[PDB]
Subunit: 376 residues, 4 copies
């Protein structure tokens, strides 16, 4: 038995690759399509990967796909749509409080991926501001009975947001909050000590956000979702990644970096459950998609744009492709669960590699005349 008593169970497993901390302490601000994940060993099929992920300290979901509360992406409609497929939705606060109240009543007065509560009503969350008049919003939201709320802000480290956190945690102890936006560990500490139940991480790296180009704030997305998640697991706090998502690759490598759920704003935009309706320009069927920092929210500054993106049909045909993509990525990484993927990442077993710009432009399609890219 001498071949066992040298090391014990584990084979040699040569040291090719870079672990997470030697990748994100080189100082360079890497983003999603700037590194990539090296594979490992698989001993299991694609179908049996369990993507059960946690949203906050008491709310777990069957899929990590959550949506961002903008007025051009989610309502009660894609809320009930993602609640039917395991995710969660948040209702934007860019409306009257009574409209958000009857919106959050419409979803809870309403396929094995459950995401519904103890009394089999659907989990659904919402977004609330941080000004003093927003108390009159979320008290009516509690009468409607919302379960998790998002303290949506450009800067997550205000005196106003931590005062609001102290205002709900004494009044509403069962209710849970989502602090953000944070990008660094200092404001992550300054929210977690206030009693935040989960963070939403990432500012500036949105498909709409130009606040890096306008306010010079923020940081690259992947370094943020690594370092805030690395700090947040010290206290047992999940994080939520926003922005910089264009495909099923970015969300997979995003929650492989320590995130538990990922927040999809543009890639869930222009669906059949999205607000408004379709229109046409140059014969392309597309729906407008607009952030709050654009001046079309209602001496002001603008931190966002107004634009549009082509459609992708219903989510009920779209998010099974997303979970199949997460499912295949967590296959060929080599873990049977997302929890095992983060365990292999923080354990140093799962290894990465930095990627240069030429390997980026060869990572996609190249050296051909024309092509049709259909993902499913």
């Amino acid at each position: 038995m001498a071949d066992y008593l040298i090391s014990g169970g584990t084979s040699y497993v040569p040291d090719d690759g870079l672990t997470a901390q030697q990748l994100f302490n080189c100082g360079d601000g890497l983003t999603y399509n700037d590194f990539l994940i090296l594979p490992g060993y698989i001993d299991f099929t694609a179908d049996q990967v369990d993507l059960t992920s946690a949203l906050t300290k008491k709310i777990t979901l069957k899929t990590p796909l959550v949506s961002s509360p903008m007025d051009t992406v989610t309502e009660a409609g894609m809320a009930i749509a993602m609640a039917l497929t395991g995710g969660i939705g948040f209702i934007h606060h860019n409306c009257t409080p009574e409209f958000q109240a009857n919106e959050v009543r419409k979803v809870k007065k309403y396929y094995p991926l459950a995401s519904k509560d103890a009394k089999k009503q659907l989990l659904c969350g919402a977004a609330i501001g941080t000004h003093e008049d927003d108390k009159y919003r979320l008290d009516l939201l509690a009468q409607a009975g919302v379960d998790v709320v998002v303290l949506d802000s450009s800067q997550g480290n205000s005196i106003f947001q931590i005062n609001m956190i102290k205002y709900i945690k004494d009044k509403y102890p069962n209710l849970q909050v989502i602090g953000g936006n944070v990008v660094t560990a200092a404001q992550a500490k300054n929210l977690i000590d206030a009693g935040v139940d989960a963070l939403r991480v990432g500012m500036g790296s949105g498909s709409i956000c130009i606040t890096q180009e306008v306010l010079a704030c923020g940081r690259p997305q992947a370094t943020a979702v690594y370092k805030v998640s690395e700090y947040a697991r010290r206290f047992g706090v999940p994080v939520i990644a926003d922005g910089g998502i264009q495909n099923v690759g970015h969300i997979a490598k995003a929650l492989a970096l320590g995130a538990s759920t990922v927040m999809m704003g543009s890639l869930l935009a222009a669906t059949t459950e999205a607000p408004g309706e379709y229109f046409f320009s140059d014969g392309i069927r597309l729906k407008k998609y607009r952030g709050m920092g654009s001046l079309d929210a209602m001496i002001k500054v603008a931190q966002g744009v107004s634009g549009a993106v082509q459609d992708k049909g219903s989510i009920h045909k779209f998010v099974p492709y997303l979970i199949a993509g997460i499912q295949h990525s967590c296959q060929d990484i080599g873990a049977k669960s997302l929890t095992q993927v983060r365990a292999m990442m923080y354990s140093g077993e799962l290894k990465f590699e930095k990627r240069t710009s030429s390997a980026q432009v060869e990572g996609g399609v190249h050296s051909l005349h024309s092509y049709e890219k259909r993902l499913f």
Copy 2:
């Protein structure tokens, strides 16, 4: 009281980020849109940030927005316009000396942001050459009574410029000078020891300048405005950043690197207070904008181009947007003043992060079909 006697007042504040000197001693020549500023903690509102900044050793301004003396951007017109909103203007020397004399008389013979002197006449500066015949310019400018002058040159380290500095500092002791252009600390020393009252830093990185591509001189702008400002505060000397400004983000992160005022050449071009008048090409209402190093200044070499840029209306609607942008950036950085921003930068409290090209191309708008970008 044991929780106070371990450290004293200050909390933990984890070490996420890079301070300025570990960012600008890696050797890489970073520019403005190549790094970005990580946020901190705010405990104050947006309106009460005080952007009072110093121009030279006795001239302080209510806003750090100054303009560059080209013949296609400023006259007495945008001089009185920026004097009305706290800034300063300089009159280009590409004219006859009598024309610059009656120009600088028109501005001083002329809304709480003051920028006017002890006898309530407007602060206004001008630009003067460095050849021997320019003595007959600036002595008439002193009879007109200009307060600060800019020794405008491509290379700030001449024997001619320091001889000129010795020529005004014995004749005109109350008059103050602006040396430049410098990009490195050696010529910064060789001007400060001559008695320069403030520097203007940055060559080659202008929107017009091709002298990096033609004379192989200069350096990237952000490293220049960090290192010349880091040397210049040893002697209590402000610096002025030129070039590479396209937006309100670059000027904010520019004066966050140690600059006190920033010099806006192209982003203040094509206004209602700009010289000439508008014209049309392809139905776009645009005004020509041309530097001195172009051959259209009057065996010669050319260090600039002649071109045009689309308009932005009056500055009185435009620079309130700029000060609101500076105001929001200094908010979510976490300082109540620009002086506090530079104190947090040199103290190591304010931290930065390098940014890669993929995080640059995701920092702007991406992953959508079309958009309308309106900043205010």
Copy 3:
């Protein structure tokens, strides 16, 4: 004889350059067009370079040019075509097993570059899947008498592939297998210990592959073909480089990094020996070229695209240009054989240099109006 007794034979040979391990342990994921090979000393003509390379442990070839088994590039046709010029071909498994059986019979029932066996029948290989029903494929392939098989898979480190390797190495001892795809040394170990006779290295970096952009797996190609070949020569195992080949430069520097043969998928596509036939779009005579991970192979995910590329005529006029390109590159590197090129690489004598993006965009054609690029 004192000039000999200081060192012995070898001259000074200054230390300009970087060897392979100091290039591929900096952590950066370099690819083919991101570094380049510094020249050495030549004492021989171009014609007498011997490009004899090994495919697996008993199969050697006269040229290292092998093709990839897709249904849009190779059949029996380009199999007999590359067997006539020293290479090898593999027949794609995306057909019925009887069709692959009569395909591999058509090639062996069939100009000094030989690549034919002991009984002067042509060497020709094929590709086989990894599912349980594929036993009924490769047993009929053995009745047809195929010599080397490729266990084609997206992830080379499955329990299924090593179980298949154990299933052929006890049944068919003379038959030889090609494991893959691997990119790292760990799965290279986990295939070599099973009894793999040669690897095929590189996933994601194909001209069709978007699985880096979709599944976030893989790594850059040149680092993979360096490190898997550096591990594989410990056990005397050749490797086969796939993907990222656009020209005769990439295959030359690819097999200079430790690869013995290189697998050409797109640059051998759209030939006269390619499947289907030509068609026209915009007046350009081009043939469709499609990978297996596209959904056009037959709730599914897609790891490839369907597209087309312009033609290059017959290979019998094309691969002499490729071997002449390899021949000239191995000339001005300074080795009389590919084996000597790998000996000079692992010995540290042959040296490399990293290349930046500006030197990349000047490495090609630049600073002119228009050009005609004809390679032969």
Copy 4:
């Protein structure tokens, strides 16, 4: 006198910048438009800079501007044209030997920048091959009396070239040779020990050359012209920089890196003294420009392209702009001669800085609608 006895003459001169060896031993393959030169101190006018540079060990020139021997750029015509303005020209060997003989007779049987010999005939050089039949070329060239010859080759380190060097240095001792192409110090040593009188450095980085993209050889240009010149001054050998020249900036920073003369192939192409004549495409008056490695020189490989570039008129109006550009760059660097520029470079006094891609794209013109770029 205590202020003198601390250091002696020299002031403090702060350590901003990077010297040459800490820039070119970081391992990165920098090229011309990837770094730039920091300014110093000037105490002199633009007109009195002396750009006297050496070609080989006995041939000095009044300007460092030499041309490359291609059949689409130089003849006797631009030979007499550059001999009139201080430079040198070489006649391409892609013709019959009698045609090159009467070409080199036409130039010597023929404005203070002299470049003419002891008996006031014009200095003019030529290019000769390396095959055995080329002896019958250069012996007739010696009867015509050429002064310097270029052993033109893709790879400067052959047994054939050093045998040729031994063949002319015993026969023709007054005649001088130009070895090349070299990019590294090893082949620089292996030519200098043979008796080479000056090198020409740089392969692959030409405007025509695709041999980096085809043969995977070569290196970036600026690192080559630094390191080969750093080795070559150990033996007192000048080097000649080819390729990667688009402007007067690249040649200035090129000979600031240790080169004495620079070889201009494309930027001297399409002149009135260039071969063939003008033609029109899309209404642009342009002349074809083609390298030898293109297949249009006469089973072959191709290392070049055939193309065209727009015209620039006569050189007698063009190279005064080039020497004025060199003259202004050597002004604001801070040296009165090119020899002083190389003395300040190797002495560590002259300092550089690496430049990133964003500072590259801001180094040129940016942030405007349209522009007219006229250099003189």
